[PDB]
């Protein structure tokens, strides 16, 4: 158990779902938690700069992220989804805690490579007072779009 802070920074080249634009927001859901960002109107490169805080019980179940086009009068169209795992992040955190302040500032603790078994668009760095994981996610099931976020815990 712990508290995962997801800083949702921005979307890049998101899909159009309302002809001229989209009104994108993100839903994160982990088991049964569902948290949402604010809506950015008429944008496919939204700068959400929005923080979500997730309560982790089970560090091994994936965290799902979905982008939607907000529309007041109909169900919101999906604009891509991605999953990520926070196992490696939680382990990098345990380590840094057990080493103490002897671990130098700016140290990259772990590099995670994009593969066919994840949604990274580039190598994800776990970096050190705070351990942080920088993620650039390739959205699945959509013709374009990426989301950039940074993870914190706890």
Question: Which residues make up each annotated binding site for Ca(2+)?
Answer: 17-18, 23, 69-71, 77
Terminal-residue alpha carbon distance, the chain: 9
Does 32 engage in binding with a second copy (CB under 8 A)? Answer: no
Q: Is 121 in the site for a second copy (CB under 8 A)?
A: yes
- Using only C-alpha atoms, the chain has a radius of gyration, in whole angstroms, of 16
Residues 57-86 as b or e (16 or more Cβ within 10 Å = b): eebeeebebbbbbbeeeeebbbbbbbebbb
Cis amide prior to 60 (ω within 30 degrees):
no
31 near a second copy (CB under 8 A)? no
Binding partner of residue 114 among a second copy, Ca ion, none, CB under 5 to 8 Å per kind? a second copy
140 binds a second copy per the rule CB under 8 A: yes
By C-beta, is 52 or 65 nearer to a second copy? 65
- Distance of alpha carbon 119 from alpha carbon 107, whole angstroms: 24
Query: Quick check: 45 binds a second copy (CB under 8 A)?
Result: no
Name the binder of 18 from Ca ion, a second copy, none, CB < 5-8 A by kind. Answer: Ca ion
Task: Compute CA 131 distance to the chain's CA centroid, rounded to the nearest angstrom.
Answer: 15
Which residue lies nearer to Ca ion by CB, 74 or 98?
A: 74
Which one of a second copy, Ca ion, none is in contact with 47 (Cβ closer than 5 to 8 A by kind)? none
- Distance, CA of 33 to CA of 22 (rounded, Å): 25
140 binds, among a second copy, Ca ion, none (CB under 5 to 8 A by kind): a second copy
Establish if 122 lies at the interface with a second copy (CB under 8 A).
Answer: yes
Question: Does residue 16 belong to the site contacting a second copy (CB under 8 A)?
Answer: no
């Amino acid at each position: 158990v712990g508290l995962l802070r997801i800083h949702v920074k921005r979307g890049v080249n998101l899909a159009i779902r309302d002809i001229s634009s989209s009104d994108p927001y993100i839903v994160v859901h982990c088991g049964k938690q569902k948290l949402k960002t604010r809506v950015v109107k008429h944008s496919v490169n939204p700068e959400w700069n929005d923080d979500l805080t997730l309560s982790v019980t089970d560090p091994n179940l994936p965290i799902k992220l979905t982008v939607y086009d907000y529309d007041l009068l109909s169900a919101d169209d999906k604009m891509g989804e991605a999953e990520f795992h926070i196992g490696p992040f939680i382990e990098a955190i345990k380590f840094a805690h057990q080493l103490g302040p002897g671990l130098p500032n700016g140290t990259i603790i772990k590099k995670i490579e994009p593969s066919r078994k994840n949604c990274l668009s580039e190598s994800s760095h776990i970096v050190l007072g705070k351990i942080v994981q920088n993620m650039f996610l390739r959205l699945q099931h959509v013709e374009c779009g990426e989301v950039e976020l940074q993870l914190e815990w706890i």
